[PDB]
Design a protein around this ligand. Structure first.
Ligand SMILES: *[C@@H]1O[C@H](CO)[C@@H](O[C@@H]2O[C@H](CO)[C@@H](O)[C@H](O)[C@H]2NC(C)=O)[C@H](O)[C@H]1NC(C)=O
Ligand SMILES: *[C@@H]1O[C@H](CO)[C@@H](O[C@@H]2O[C@H](CO)[C@@H](O)[C@H](O)[C@H]2NC(C)=O)[C@H](O)[C@H]1NC(C)=O
Ligand SMILES: *[C@@H]1O[C@H](CO)[C@@H](O[C@@H]2O[C@H](CO)[C@@H](O)[C@H](O)[C@H]2NC(C)=O)[C@H](O)[C@H]1NC(C)=O
Ligand SMILES: *[C@@H]1O[C@H](CO)[C@@H](O[C@@H]2O[C@H](CO)[C@@H](O)[C@H](O)[C@H]2NC(C)=O)[C@H](O)[C@H]1NC(C)=O
Ligand SMILES: *[C@@H]1O[C@H](CO)[C@@H](O[C@@H]2O[C@H](CO)[C@@H](O)[C@H](O)[C@H]2NC(C)=O)[C@H](O)[C@H]1NC(C)=O
Ligand SMILES: *[C@@H]1O[C@H](CO)[C@@H](O[C@@H]2O[C@H](CO)[C@@H](O)[C@H](O)[C@H]2NC(C)=O)[C@H](O)[C@H]1NC(C)=O
Ligand SMILES: *[C@@H]1O[C@H](CO)[C@@H](O[C@@H]2O[C@H](CO)[C@@H](O)[C@H](O)[C@H]2NC(C)=O)[C@H](O)[C@H]1NC(C)=O
Ligand SMILES: CC(=O)N[C@@H]1[C@@H](O)[C@H](O)[C@@H](CO)O[C@H]1O
Ligand SMILES: *[C@@H]1O[C@H](CO)[C@@H](O)[C@H](O)[C@H]1NC(C)=O
Ligand SMILES: *[C@@H]1O[C@H](CO)[C@@H](O)[C@H](O)[C@H]1NC(C)=O
Ligand SMILES: *[C@@H]1O[C@H](CO)[C@@H](O)[C@H](O)[C@H]1NC(C)=O
Ligand SMILES: *[C@@H]1O[C@H](CO)[C@@H](O)[C@H](O)[C@H]1NC(C)=O
Lengths: 115, 168, 213, 49
């Protein structure tokens, strides 16, 4: 078949910016018709690919997000979270000496309009 | 996802213009399939991404006699799976009909499951209510017997038996 | 802590989505009336005005079939979507019983942390739960041991853990640091000091003898 | 189950495996999750008055 696929537009919202990048899913960047980056998920146009990893801001897909940080728009590999080693030993314990009271919300729908 | 135009007409201009007489059926079709495709990534975040930190076990993998090497990642395998997860993964463009990739890869899910495993072995059930608090494992198992109505001396005088039975 | 809740509000996207989904099905259902479905026109009066009955019955029957299909699509989706809001109402009713009318031990069912209490609030087409939880803070590390030897016998805590501050050993409760001296009223005896791995020597004080001088 | 079987100890009968729940360990699967449930099961009863 003569390579085909959907076209989606990535936008931060017109109240933030009017810049957009376009991913052509599993389309090679030589057969589409600046910042052109080839990924195994398709051809990414309009974002620069960096080797750092940040918290996800604008989600693109397959582990890659974009953000307006360092301004045009960038493509980068997402960070998963902070890292932390527990100080385990065979005769050590950790016990709290103080506490806080927290409050959190949870929201649940219960009904629709009757038509 | 399915492209309605390539399914119904298939590169035909006479048919494509006729699709305009049916209204917004393709709008409904794209939204119906997209609305349930977004939930599929949400389903996997709610199961595995229940920990804030990525916990690691100590290099001295040895816990009161309990052997956890079959459930912890094995630094010598495809990506980073446990020996048991390898059994689990080893045992299991037409005309518009497109398959979209998941957001989380299998390597990313393995990293969530290995962090949950490290937390429950080194920190018990404390990391799910705040900061991870270390406690030796033999003492974690004694608490867990207390929680079901068994006194704690029954574990400490039989520690070798329970570790042998668990490992087998 | 409760006062901060208003700041986080002044969220409810799950409630707006319910409104949006029904508004979109009603806007689509009406718009589907302006479709010809391959007929000469889309208006059942205009057909007659410019056509004989023998042929007008066919053209109107096509439009009827098309718009009847629209109603079948609409009603089928309302049944599938009503099952989802029903499952949500069942979860909300279950939390109302178990989070508001009692104290739950179910992890993460009534908020993050150790459940103390919850307060309901009414929202349009929904419910909001204010979850009050207990969160420990500011930990210190200690050395511990499973039991203590005294007179050749093993002593185990009734509730709590043994800790050491560097020079002396105490009994503490597990959820708040509050040390007390290890006595015969705080502990119980079971077995000898030959089966417990990691048992340590210390003094367990008997209140009887210093009362008898 | 992830919260109530792995991040804690449950008393719900049969919810976290058969027997008295002690602990659980998750494993990943291609489109799902596999739980390993560890339970306590009594054995060898005797008669008493
Ligand atoms: C436990 O934490 C609270 C703070 O969350 C401490 O209370 C504060 O103590 C300082 C002095 O150390 C006072 O200046 C503050 O006014 C106190 N805050 C409140 C809200 O009263 C409390 O002292 C801590 N306990 C321990 C043992 O450190
Ligand atoms: C925990 O169990 C693993 C097996 O699941 C043990 O690894 C085996 O060890 C023996 C002795 O060295 C070898 O012959 C096997 O080839 C090992 N298996 C694998 C897959 O490498 C391991 O030794 C056990 N750990 C402890 C501390 O006993
Ligand atoms: C409790 O039962 C276990 C078996 O479930 C007993 O342990 C076995 O004992 C036999 C006989 O000495 C040994 O050959 C096996 O190797 C043991 N199994 C294991 C896994 O260690 C145990 O002795 C029983 N306890 C009592 C007090 O009778
Ligand atoms: C551990 O705590 C004890 C008790 O507070 C400290 O020992 C001293 O104990 C005598 C009674 O036997 C008290 O009169 C002293 O005031 C205590 N000293 C202090 C500084 O509290 C002991 O010092 C503590 N150990 C460490 C390493 O801090
Ligand atoms: C906890 O582990 C440490 C090792 O990491 C043990 O320390 C060793 O203790 C033995 C005697 O049992 C000594 O011969 C070694 O020289 C010690 N090693 C080091 C590096 O100091 C310690 O005994 C363990 N604790 C328990 C209760 O088993
Ligand atoms: C804890 O105290 C007991 C009782 O004093 C110690 O048992 C003695 O151990 C020594 C060897 O270390 C023997 O020579 C004695 O015969 C034992 N005494 C009795 C009454 O059996 C024990 O060793 C102490 N534990 C530690 C770690 O010091
Ligand atoms: C406790 O005692 C009862 C009898 O009071 C035992 O019942 C036996 O059950 C077996 C079947 O399992 C029958 O075939 C026997 O006839 C019964 N015996 C009698 C005397 O009625 C029961 O087995 C005993 N339980 C244990 C655990 O030993
Ligand atoms: C064995 C271990 O984890 N030790 C840590 C150490 O690495 C860290 O620098 C210190 C302060 O955070 O806390 C402790
Ligand atoms: C949207 O625009 C309004 C002003 O019209 C502004 O107050 C608000 O911060 C904007 N929102 C975002 C997310 O930028
Ligand atoms: C696109 O085509 C070029 C050759 O023209 C090739 O080198 C490149 O690897 C192709 N990209 C992909 C993603 O296949
Ligand atoms: C990222 O790192 C790889 C090596 O891991 C290197 O080949 C590549 O050029 C780097 N990318 C950029 C944009 O510097
Ligand atoms: C306890 O000690 C460990 C090192 O053994 C350290 O990493 C940890 O930060 C200490 N905890 C506190 C509260 O100091």
């Amino acid at each position: 078949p003569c390579s085909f696929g959907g076209v989606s537009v990535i936008t931060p919202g017109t109240n933030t910016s009017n810049q957009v990048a376009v991913l052509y899913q599993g389309v090679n960047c030589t057969e589409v018709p600046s910042n052109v980056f080839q990924t195994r998920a398709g051809c990414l146009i309009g974002a620069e690919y960096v080797n750092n990893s940040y918290e996800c801001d604008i989600p693109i897909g397959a582990g890659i997000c974009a953000s307006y940080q360092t301004q045009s728009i960038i493509a980068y590999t997402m960070s998963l979270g902070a890292e932390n080693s527990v100080a385990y030993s065979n005769n050590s314990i950790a016990i709290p000496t103080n506490f806080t009271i927290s409050v959190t919300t949870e929201i649940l729908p219960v009904s629709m309009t009757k038509t | 996802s399915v492209d309605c135009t390539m399914y119904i007409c298939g590169d035909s201009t006479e048919c494509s213009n006729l699709l305009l007489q049916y209204g917004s059926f393709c709008t409904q079709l794209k939204r119906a399939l997209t609305g349930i495709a977004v939930e599929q990534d949400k389903n996997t975040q709610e199961v595995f991404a229940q920990v804030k930190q990525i916990y690691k076990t100590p290099p001295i993998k040895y816990f009161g006699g309990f052997n956890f090497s079959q459930i912890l990642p094995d630094p010598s395998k495809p990506s980073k799976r446990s020996p048991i997860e390898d059994l689990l993964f080893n045992k299991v463009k037409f005309k518009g009909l497109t398959v979209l990739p998941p957001l989380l890869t299998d390597e990313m899910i393995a990293q969530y499951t290995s962090a949950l495993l490290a937390g429950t072995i080194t920190s018990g059930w404390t990391f799910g209510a705040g900061p991870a608090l270390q406690i030796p494992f033999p003492m974690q198992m004694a608490y867990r017997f207390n929680g079901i109505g068994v006194t704690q001396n029954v574990l400490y005088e039989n520690q070798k038996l329970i570790a042998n039975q668990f490992n087998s | 802590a409760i006062g901060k809740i208003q700041d986080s509000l002044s969220a409810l996207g799950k409630l707006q989505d319910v409104v949006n989904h029904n508004a979109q099905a009603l806007n689509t259902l009406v718009k589907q009336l302006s479709s010809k479905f391959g007929a000469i026109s889309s208006v059942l009066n205009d057909i007659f005005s410019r056509l004989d009955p023998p042929e007008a019955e066919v053209q109107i029957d096509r439009l009827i079939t098309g718009r009847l299909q629209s109603l079948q699509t609409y009603v089928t989706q309302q049944l599938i979507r009503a099952a989802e809001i029903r499952a949500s109402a069942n979860l909300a009713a279950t939390k109302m019983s178990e989070c508001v009318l009692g104290q739950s031990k179910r992890v993460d069912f009534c908020g993050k942390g150790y459940h103390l209490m919850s307060f309901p609030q009414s929202a349009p087409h929904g419910v909001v739960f204010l979850h009050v939880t207990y969160v420990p803070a500011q930990e210190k590390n200690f050395t511990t041991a499973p039991a203590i030897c005294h007179d050749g016998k093993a002593h185990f805590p009734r509730e709590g853990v043994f800790v050491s501050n560097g020079t002396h050993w105490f009994v503490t409760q597990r959820n708040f640091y509050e040390p007390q001296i290890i006595t015969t009223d705080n502990t119980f005896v079971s077995g000898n000091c030959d089966v417990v791995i990691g048992i340590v020597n210390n003094t367990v004080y008997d209140p009887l003898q210093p009362e008898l001088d």
